[PDB]
Structure 1
C-alpha cells in the first residue's frame, strides 16, 4: 500500500453516476500499489510531516492562496518550505501557502484566465480534469462553485503535490487525483464538464482521445479542449518525425480549424475556437521551484518563432464543445 484511496471509494459509492466506476477502478488501483515507485516512500514520509489541520483563510477564486489569521511559527514555516521543496519539480501553479510562494514553471493562472470567460458556469457541476498535473485548475474549478472535481494524471509526483496542497487546505474531499491515464476509464457519462488541457498531442490516437472525453460527459455536457496547434486551415496538421520542443512521444498538432472538424467528426456540436496563444517565456520558464530546462531552451536560440528542431514554436488553442442532448 503506497496510498490508500479509501476516501475516494466512499465518495463514488454514494454517487449514482460514479458508483459503476467501482466495477473496474479498485483492481486498477490495487495493480498501481504493487508497481512500487523508487521515490514514493520518501515523498510520503515528507507529505506525512506537513502540518495537519484547517487554515483560517482560503482564496481559490482569484489564485490558490492559503493563510492563517495568526502569523505561523517562524521555524514551522522553514520546515514546511523544505518539505514542499522535496516535491521538485513544481511545474503547475503558482501556489501561495502561508506566505510561501511556490513559483511554478507555468503561469497556470494565465491559462485559467484564457479559459474562464468561455465556459458554462461551474456552480454545482461535477468536473473531470484529464491530465490535471498537480490539480492547480481543480482548485480554481472549486473556486467557481464546482461540486466535485476528479483529476486523472499518471505521474506519482503530481499525486504527492496534490495531496500536499489538499492537506494544507484541511483535507478538502471535493477534489481528488487518481493515478490513471484517460485510456483506463470506462464509459461513465457522469460529468457535467470535462477539461483536457495539454493531453491530446501526447496521445497516439487523437480521435480516440476525443471519443474517450465524450464518453465521460452527461448528455448536453461541455468539453474544454486545450492543446498545441499550428496555424492553417482544416488540412493543416503537423506530426513531427522526432521531438517537438524537446518532448518525446508526441503525435498530432492539428490547426485549431482541423481540430474543430475532428471534434465534429466524432459527434461534438457547437464547437467554438475561443482562444489561440503563442506561449511567451513569461508563461513557461525555469524558476527556483523548477530548476530544469524550460521553454527558452526549447526554442531556436536565434528565432523564438521556431522550436530547436525547426517546427513552429508552441501555440496553444482553447476549443469549447457540447456533447449532443439536453443537459439534465
Structure 2
C-alpha cells in the first residue's frame, strides 16, 4: 500500500450511477500501488506532517483561501510553508493557506472567471475533471455548489498536492483525485458536467478522446474542452513532425473551428467557442533581478510569435458542448 483509496471506494459504493465503476477501478489502483514509486513515498512523509483538522474559514467562491480566526504560531507556519514548498512545481492555482500565498505557474483563477459565465450552473451537478492537475478547479466547482467532483490525472505529484489542500480543508470528501487516464474509465454516463483540460493534444486518437468524454456524461450533460490550437478555419490542423514548444508525445492541434466540427462529428450538439488566447495570457513568469531572457524557453528568442521549432506560438481554446437528450433533475 502506497496510498489507500478506501474513502473513494466508500463514496462510489453508496452512489448508484458510480457503483458500476467498482467492476474495473480497484484492480487499476492495486496495480498503481505496485508501479514505479518515484518520489511518492518521500512526498507522502511530508503530507503526513501537515496538520490535521478543520480550518475556521474557507473561501472557494472568489478564490481558494483557507484561514483560522486565531492565526498559527510562527514555528508551525514556517514548518507548513516548508512542507508545501517540497511539492514544487505548483502549476494550477493560486492558493492562500493560513497566510502562505502558493504563487502558481498558471493563473487558473483568471481562466475560471472568463469561462464561468458560459457554463451551465454547477449547483448540485456531479463533475468529472479530466487532466485536473493538483485539483484547483474542483474546489472552485464546489464553491459554485457542485455536489461531487472527481479528478483524474496520472501524476504522483498532483495527487500529493491535492491531498495536502484537501487535508488543510479538513478532509472534504466531495472532491477526489484518481491517478488514471480517461482511457481507463468504463462507459459510466454518470456526470452532469465533464471538463477536459489540456489533454486532447497528448492523445494519438483525438476523436477517441472526445467519445471517451461523451461516454462519462448523462443525457443532456455538458462538456468544457480546453486544448492547444492554431489559427484557421475548419480544415486547419497542425501535426508536428517532432516536438511542439519543446513537448514530446504531441499529436493534433486543430483550429478552434476545426475542433467544433470534430465535436459535432462524434455527436455533440450546441458547440460554442467561448475563449481563445495565447497561452501566456494565463501563465505567470519568474521575473526577478537574476532573470536573463524573459521569453519562455519554448518560444523563439528571435521571434516570440513562433515556437523554438518555428510553429505558431501556443494558443488555448475553450469549447462548450451538450450531449444529446433532455438533462434530468433540472
**What TM-score do you get using the length of structure 1 for normalisation?**
0.96
Q: Secondary structure at the match of 1:295?
A: coil
Cα distance change of structure 1 residues 310 and 274 upon mapping to structure 2, 3 Å threshold: same
Task: Give the 4+ runs in structure 1 shifted more than 6 A.
Answer: 287-295
**C-alpha separation in 2, matches of 1:178 and 1:168:** 19
**C-alpha separation in 1, matches of 2:48 and 2:93:** 22
Cα distance change of structure 1 residues 302 and 289 upon mapping to structure 2, 3 Å threshold: closer
Q: CA deviation at 1:284?
A: 3.7
Structure-1 residue corresponding to 2:95: 95
1:54-89 Cα shifts (integer Å, max 9, x gaps): 000111111111000001111000000010011111
Answering whether residue 223 of structure 2 is matched by residue 228 of structure 1, we say: no
Q: Secondary structure at the match of 2:324?
A: coil
Contact 1:236 / 1:258 at 8 angstroms: preserved in 2? Answer: yes
Contact 1:218 / 1:327 at 8 angstroms: preserved in 2? Answer: no
Cα distance change of structure 1 residues 216 and 250 upon mapping to structure 2, 3 Å threshold: same
Q: CA deviation at 1:294?
A: 10
Q: Which moved more, 1:116-125 or 1:296-305?
A: 296-305
Contact 1:238 / 1:253 at 8 angstroms: preserved in 2? Answer: yes
Aligned length in residues: 328
Cα distance change of structure 1 residues 19 and 240 upon mapping to structure 2, 3 Å threshold: same
Cα distance change of structure 1 residues 238 and 183 upon mapping to structure 2, 3 Å threshold: same
**What TM-score do you get using the length of structure 2 for normalisation?**
0.96
Cα distance change of structure 1 residues 248 and 135 upon mapping to structure 2, 3 Å threshold: same
Q: CA deviation at 1:223?
A: 0.2
Cα distance change of structure 1 residues 186 and 12 upon mapping to structure 2, 3 Å threshold: same
Q: Which moved more, 1:37-46 or 1:11-20?
A: 37-46
**C-alpha separation in 1, matches of 2:195 and 2:85:** 28
Contact 1:221 / 1:327 at 8 angstroms: preserved in 2? Answer: no
Q: Which moved more, 1:279-288 or 1:119-128?
A: 279-288
Answering whether residue 118 of structure 2 is matched by residue 118 of structure 1, we say: yes
Q: CA deviation at 1:280?
A: 2.3
Contact 2:110 / 2:282 at 8 angstroms: preserved in 1? Answer: no
> Which blocks of at least 5 consecutive residues in structure 1 are unaligned?
none
Matches within 5 A, 1:175-186: 175-186=175-186
Contact 1:88 / 1:289 at 8 angstroms: preserved in 2? Answer: no
Cα distance change of structure 1 residues 289 and 2 upon mapping to structure 2, 3 Å threshold: farther
Q: Secondary structure at the match of 2:162?
A: helix
> Which blocks of at least 5 consecutive residues in structure 2 are unaligned?
none
Q: Secondary structure at the match of 1:251?
A: coil
**C-alpha separation in 2, matches of 1:125 and 1:221:** 10
Answering whether residue 319 of structure 2 is matched by residue 319 of structure 1, we say: yes
Q: CA deviation at 1:305?
A: 1.2
Q: CA deviation at 1:307?
A: 1.0
**C-alpha separation in 1, matches of 2:217 and 2:323:** 7
| Root mean square deviation of aligned Cα | 2.2
